[PDB]
UniProtKB/TrEMBL annotation:
The keyword Protease does not apply. A lipid is attached at residue 116 (Phosphatidylserine amidated glycine). The lineage of its organism: Eukaryota, Metazoa, Ecdysozoa, Arthropoda, Hexapoda. It is found in: Cytoplasmic vesicle, Autophagosome; Endomembrane system. Belongs to the ATG8 family. This is Gamma-aminobutyric acid receptor-associated protein. PANTHER family: MICROTUBULE-ASSOCIATED PROTEINS 1A/1B LIGHT CHAIN 3-RELATED. InterPro entries: Atg8-like, Ubiquitin-like_domsf. The gene is LOC113211372. One of its GO terms (biological process) is autophagy. Signal peptide: none annotated. Transmembrane segments: none annotated. It comes from Frankliniella occidentalis. GO terms for cellular component: autophagosome; cytoplasmic vesicle; endomembrane system. Keywords: Autophagy, Cytoplasm, Cytoplasmic vesicle, Lipoprotein, Membrane, Receptor.
């Protein structure tokens, strides 16, 4: 999918910011989080996150659930390079495996239709 953060910031600006963040704050990782366009769930206020490396996917899910008012029976999944990471994974481990050449990790969030209609 197309991330709006990329449309609004050219590669060299993104890469400069990403490299700076990583040099200045090596204990955290910069993450862009955007809603998959077809997902019928709420939008997050903020797209750009600087999270401690050991924050887990499940902990990020819980934070998002509170912010967009999801109930436990509502589904919520992250999609990183077309795969859904396990809730136990840390954001630092995903960053190390999947960060793009601008030194950001890009995460899409969706509902149960993350792969297409369930």
């Amino acid at each position: 999918m197309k991330f709006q953060y990329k449309e609004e910031h050219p590669f060299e600006k993104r890469k400069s910011e990403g490299e700076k963040i990583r040099r200045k704050y090596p204990d955290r990782v910069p993450v862009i989080v955007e809603k998959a366009p077809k997902a019928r769930i709420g939008d997050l206020d903020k797209k750009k996150y600087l999270v401690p490396s050991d924050l887990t996917v499940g902990q990020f899910y819980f934070l998002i659930r509170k912010r967009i008012h999801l109930r436990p029976e509502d589904a919520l999944f992250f999609l990183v390079n077309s795969v859904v990471p396990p809730s136990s994974a840390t954001m630092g481990s995903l960053y190390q495996e999947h960060h793009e050449e601008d030194f950001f990790l890009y995460i899409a969030y969706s509902d149960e239709n993350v792969y297409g209609k369930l």
